[PDB]
Amino acid sequence: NYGRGRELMYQLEKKGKEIKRDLEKILLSGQARTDVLADQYLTNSAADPA
Amino acid sequence: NYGRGRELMYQLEKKGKEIKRDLEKILLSGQARTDVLADQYLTNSAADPA
């Protein structure tokens, strides 16, 4: 290529930066937590192994 | 009284020994576990909010 080296190493670095920008956007968002707590302590009942 | 002491330390030891005679029987009486936790052990949050 004309203005770069290998395409694997180039695109890899781009993803290394994009993942940090995505993390910043995620922490500073309003998304709600999602999990399968499923009747935890106070009668955990083995965390509902079902 | 005859043989007996002050009648308070006397009865205490009588019951202090019976507590062991009961433990030996409880651990072999084949009873069933009973508690109001409702399988809420692996939670470390609360037995049950209710």
Length of chain B (residues): 50
What type of residue sits at position A18? E
Distance from CA of A27 to the nearest CA of B (A): 26
Q: Which residues of chain A are at the B interface, by a Cβ-Cβ cutoff of 8 Å?
A: 39-47
Residue A30, Cβ density class (10 Å: 0-12 exposed, 13-18 middle, ≥19 buried):
exposed
Chain-centroid distance of CA A35 in Å reads 14
Chain-centroid distance of CA B32 in Å reads 15
- Rounded to whole angstroms, the Cα distance separating A17 from A4 reads 17
Cβ neighbors of A31 (< 8 A, separation 6 or more) are none
Cβ atoms B45, A40 nearer than 8 A: yes
Cβ atoms B26, B20 nearer than 8 A: no
What type of residue sits at position B10? Y
Sort out which chain B residues have CB atoms less than 8 A from A39's CB and list them.
Answer: 40, 43
Cβ pairs A/B, distance under 8 A: 47
Closest CA to B37 of A16, A19, A42, A49: A42
Closest CA to B46 of A7, A42, A6: A42
A42–B39 CB contact, under 8 Å = no
Resolution in A: 3.5
